[PDB]
Homo-oligomer: 563 residues x 2
């Protein structure tokens, strides 16, 4: 079947769109080459639509059947409950797309207006009707990148397909508890979203170390969501239903599967019929969990098909890393081709052919890699790194155009130990917060696909809890990290690191002059900028924060919230 | 001055006391030699009173003045707030000693009866009157031990000295926030109560590793509370007051210091005047924090006096470990004598002279030592161990006489990776919980001096969070751990480990037959008892638990609660 069919109606914007980075003295002090920064818009929706539309064929085999049998057995030891309406409402992000039925996120979160009665009505209809397709809206995402001259120029917008807010709340009542329990039960240590960046690094280090002669690869599926078949989605349902669930949840889960998850009609923002979907919806609660489980089953089965020796996997939605025992140069290349051919039969063909790697630091997981630097007293510290170009480009856009749900804060938290976060993002944003006099205001951001709310003054505690006190004393960064950052700064027309150091000394002094939590930010976040360094003590707040749970699957379009 | 003066009136029981372990088929199946197990009672109060009563002289010097100056500077960066009455009430343990003024812990926790109005009245009196000594009650603690023939036989009861429940709630309003923030600020990594057992092991490993040639010792102060002088306690106040505090807190803290902390009259349970105290009260909120800070100041100053080279300390109340650079056998012995002489001038004379140790595993912190075993795939795992004799003796008593606040559950959690917890305590208590049909009931226990509430069915998640999945797969225990446990079991007349293994196989099967969380306990806690072992996956609940904060100073008599 085809992943999508189309009527010819346009994918239309629901609001004015801007493609070019606006000029502005605040953003200009971060980077000058604003014509290199662009935002995707509906203008390129048609191009994306073409890419994500294709035929799927799927031929399964004994390896697949055996893996699925195991997964269902493991799933049978899981017990999950319904969420109450109030609980599901509290998980709705502040700016979640408003309903067509006369209420928005504000009303959901406060249990006011039409919200409660409408959501109750939707739930009852799910229990009574397991058949009628539920309508969805398709939209072009507005996301910011830096041009890549020698690589095609500009990426087309991603497409997001989602049902009404009322349905999204019902999804949580039916399935949120399952998202919290099922992935770990069926995939164990392989489930990537259970890990903080530090824990992901630790897992990868351990996986690598336990092989006599390690070989790893990442596998890039072309347009994962579109490769997911109706049968795949019904198989996800059979896994959900293997858990112990109350009848009412079983009923709602089956209805959501047949009315929403497996496919349905898509409309544009104008209300015109735009097409029909027969693949994964990109904006539902189960997008991430579903992709993770389905990638895992296909990938484990393909390892068996290929004869991969002692696979250890890290799976994050459609992002796949496989570490195993090397069988030699030529055998590894051969086995990787067999792996790809099996994945292809299972409907998950490759975007770029996988490559065997024999150095752990070359393996990418979710655009990130392991890097190493020195902490206090020369000890080696491993941490997660990435290319800073996209983060820096988005930081610039978000300085001039305020995003209700930003990305710079998510990047500071996830990549806190990196040289670019420490010297550039922290310096720039603490300066901006002081200019705005908004240091002590909670901000919403996205991380691991979902929404969080944090007060920038709590960053030292958050960073310590997630990355350790060493995040504040890292030095002797790797050559790759140093070239990576210098290159990105030059490319974007940003000041070089030596200029950022000068800037940070002043930002630090200004924070310290304010006393209180602002002074803590100055002392801890900017210890790197002074020659007479302070000895930093463990922050009490770092333990007092409830954060252990922070990292979970999340949702499609990230429609899950935690403050 | 003398630590105490006495009137001659008796230290009297407030309830019937039992000295001998009762016989009972449930407790007998744990250990048969019941005449070896005893409980301290008021019968031996007089003997303890003699031991804790002595003259104190204190001569300070430039090393002490310099350390204190530093501590106050660090304290000045701390900001703390008052707790509201409601907050302080929620921190009161369910069975806290009832007030003389017609209410108990139940009324405090529910904010009902006379409790609120009485506590308000006490607070106002603290603000108005900084002078009048506050009365306290002195009691003999009832604690269980095993006889030590060749070591004096039976220990006398410890004494506990505490003010009325109403005052104890006011202490929390005034000072709880300080307990959460100040120790880490002034002592940094040295503050021991911030660490879980695993983190304590990690700290000690790191401290040892960072010395070119490590030497460590523990220092045992004779009767620490009694060595604490009125000046010491007023110095603690000056440290508290160095923080940024609201005037009302400053006022209450000064009044509590002068009316309660520095000394005051003691009465027995009959209401007779028993004596007067001029040293640390053993049952106040500040007992642990106070002892920790005062031990730290004296110990750091004494290191300077002695010329100890590069001290790294771990301080837990009066429990002190010092790791430093060895200066050679003879110089180390000499320097340790100088350290002791300085501690002695500062009023903290030794019970047993400190001994230099050159093997990390021989260093004791809070009766515990580092041990090592093998986890999955042969990797070395370090963890905290102790002698199991006292835990086993108390487990027996608590099987036949139910304690409102027990110790066996605290021991299972703290020492989860140990062979005795895994094979003996877990087997015995899960069996007992099934006999009683109370598996799924919250239990209160003491840990690190304070009270916690846990449901035994949550143990696998708690254990994983605190100790890692390896707690469930440890093998190849050390020779010392093996001899230690075999010896203790023989001494107490308990079955040998091979019998416990047989017992556990049946307990495991019974848990698994029950499904649900009980089956999880069977699979995870008792994987060691089966030859065909299950592969255990990470438990979702382990992250979903808010536990990062669990470990803090606590309070005297442990009058702090967290469910």
């Amino acid at each position: 079947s085809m992943s999508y069919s189309w009527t010819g109606a346009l994918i239309t914007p629901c609001s004015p769109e801007e493609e070019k980075l606006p000029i502005n003295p605040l953003s200009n002090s971060l980077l000058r080459y604003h014509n290199k920064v662009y935002c995707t818009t509906s203008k390129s929706a048609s191009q994306r639509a073409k890419k994500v539309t294709f035929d799927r064929t799927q031929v399964l085999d004994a390896h697949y059947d055996s893996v699925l049998k195991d997964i269902k057995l493991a799933a049978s030891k899981v017990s999950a409950r319904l969420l109450t309406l109030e609980e599901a409402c509290q998980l709705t992000p502040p700016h979640s797309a408003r309903s067509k039925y006369g209420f928005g996120a504000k009303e959901v979160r406060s249990l006011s207006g039409r919200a409660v009665n409408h959501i109750k009505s939707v739930w009852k209809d799910l229990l009574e009707d397991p058949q009628t397709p539920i309508p969805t809206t398709i939209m072009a995402k507005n996301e910011v990148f830096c041009v890549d001259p020698a690589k095609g120029g500009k990426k087309p917008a991603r497409l997001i397909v989602y049902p009404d807010l009322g349905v999204r709340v019902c999804e949580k009542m039916a399935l949120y508890d399952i998202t919290q329990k099922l992935p770990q039960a069926v995939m164990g240590a392989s489930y990537g979203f259970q890990y903080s960046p530090a824990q992901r690094v630790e897992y990868l280090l351990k996986a690598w170390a336990e092989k006599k002669d390690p070989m790893g690869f990442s596998y890039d599926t072309r347009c994962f969501d579109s490769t997911v078949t109706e049968r795949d989605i019904r198989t996800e349902e059979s896994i959900y239903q293997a858990c112990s669930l109350p009848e009412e949840a079983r009923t709602a889960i089956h209805s959501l599967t047949e009315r929403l998850y497996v496919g349905g009609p898509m409309f544009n923002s104008k209300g015109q019929t735009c097409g029909y979907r027969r693949c994964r919806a990109s904006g539902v609660l189960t997008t991430s969990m579903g992709n993770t489980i389905t990638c895992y089953v296909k990938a484990l089965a393909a390892c068996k098909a290929a004869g991969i020796v002692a696979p250890t996997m890290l799976v994050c939605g459609d992002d796949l890393v496989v570490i195993s025992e090397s069988q030699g140069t030529e055998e590894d290349e051969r086995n990787l081709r067999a792996f790809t051919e099996a994945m292809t039969r299972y409907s998950a063909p490759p975007g770029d052919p996988p490559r065997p790697e024999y150095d752990l630091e070359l393996i990418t997981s979710c655009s990130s890699n392991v890097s190493v630097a020195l902490g206090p007293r020369g000890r080696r510290r491993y941490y997660l790194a990435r290319d800073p170009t996209t983060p820096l480009a988005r930081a610039a856009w978000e300085t001039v155009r305020h995003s209700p749900i930003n990305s710079w804060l998510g990047n500071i938290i996830q990549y806190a130990p990196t040289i670019w976060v420490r010297m550039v993002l922290m310096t720039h944003f603490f300066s901006i917060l002081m200019v705005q006099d908004t240091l002590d205001q909670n901000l919403n951001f996205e991380m691991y696909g979902s929404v969080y709310s944090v007060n920038p003054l709590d960053l030292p505690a958050i960073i310590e809890r997630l990355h350790g006190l060493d995040a504040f004393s890292m030095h002797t960064y790797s050559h790759h990290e140093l070239t990576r950052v210098a290159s990105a700064l030059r490319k974007l027309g940003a000041p070089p690191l030596r200029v950022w150091k000068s800037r940070a000394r002043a930002v630090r002094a200004s924070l310290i002059s304010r006393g209180g939590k602002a002074a803590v930010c100055g002392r801890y976040l900017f210890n790197w900028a002074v020659k007479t360094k302070l000895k930093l003590t463990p922050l009490p707040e770092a333990r007092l924060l409830d954060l252990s749970s922070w990292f979970t699957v999340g949702a499609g379009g990230g429609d899950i919230f935690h403050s």
